Design a binder for this molecule. Structure first.
Ligand SMILES: NC(=O)c1cnc(N[C@@H]2CCCC[C@@H]2N)nc1Nc1cccc(-n2nccn2)c1
Length: 273
């Protein structure tokens, strides 16, 4: 499915951090573009750890999911580099990075309208996936990328894209899934094979909580055992201090998966504010 990119056409530059069994770099791809123009394009290079090569299928299936459909709110995958012993996903480089970092850095100048616009865009991307019956499986603020900053001077809203989910929770070790509470929904802690469209509605709620909490991580003070007991006791997240979306967050984070609202209903709710 994926376009194969030669290792020789890729330059690896600085490490940007780590994902689950991955290391992430900024790089450059040399390519021929439209009209035969030569380009040296900034790219995100996502590299599967050699020690976890056994996850390669799920590693690439994540990307393949995103590239099944084309949409203005979904990250572009340029291709893969599987030369030699490396498993590399090549993705569009998104200048302003992921939303959790951006929210933490830019608290003082992010207001409720900015959060509402971003929430609406994420809901639009999820409605598109839901209409296509395509599960994402790892909606969270780290996987939302800021393409364009809000410019109140020209009325331009911010613009985000949803990035790929990474290796699926259906294959990850149990301890990692538990560390990912409360993004991973309770039914998936009970049985990771319970991954379903309803999964994304729960994680969407958790992500809205991040958006409203300046990039804080919900339940970060709880170790894994306490996160588990949080689900066992059927707790909900505290309302963010900016609590405008708190009812929507809790409605999405419904312990009954069948009761979680459709993304059309979610969008209708967002539009009402
Ligand atoms: N498609 C992308 O461009 C992209 C995708 N994912 C991520 N995730 C980042 C890196 C890996 C760990 C998690 C962290 N949120 N960052 C991206 N771009 C980016 C752009 C500017 C700066 C940085 N940056 N500088 C220091 C750290 N991150 C990253």
């Amino acid at each position: 499915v994926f376009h194969k990119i030669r290792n020789e056409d890729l330059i690896f530059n600085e490490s940007l951090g780590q994902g689950t069994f991955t290391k992430i770099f900024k790089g450059v791809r040399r390519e021929v573009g439209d009209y035969g123009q030569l380009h040296e394009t900034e790219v995100l290079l996502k590299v599967l750890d050699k020690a976890h090569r056994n996850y390669s299928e799920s590693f690439f299936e994540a990307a393949s999911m995103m590239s099944k459909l084309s949409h203005k709110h979904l990250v572009l995958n340029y291709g893969v580099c599987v030369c030699g012993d490396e498993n590399i996903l090549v993705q569009e480089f998104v200048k302003f990075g992921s939303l959790d970092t951006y929210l933490k850095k830019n608290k003082n100048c992010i207001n409720i309208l900015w959060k509402l616009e971003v929430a609406k865009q994420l809901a639009a991307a999820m409605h598109f996936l839901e209409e296509n019956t395509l599960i994402h499986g790892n909606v969270c603020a780290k996987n939302i990328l800021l393409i364009r900053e809000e410019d109140r001077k020209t009325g331009n809203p911010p613009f985000i894209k949803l990035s790929d989910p990474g290796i699926s929770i259906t294959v990850l070790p149990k301890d990692i899934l538990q560390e990912r509470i409360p993004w991973v929904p309770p039914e998936c802690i009970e049985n990771p094979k319970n991954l379903n469209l309803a999964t994304d509605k729960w994680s969407f709620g958790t992500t809205l909580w991040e958006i409203c909490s300046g990039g804080d991580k919900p339940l970060s003070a709880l170790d894994s055992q306490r996160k588990l007991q949080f689900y066992e006791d059927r707790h909900q997240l505290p309302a963010p201090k900016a609590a405008e979306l708190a009812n929507l967050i809790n409605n999405c984070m419904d312990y009954e998966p069948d009761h979680r609202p459709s993304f059309r209903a979610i969008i209708r709710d967002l539009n009402s504010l």
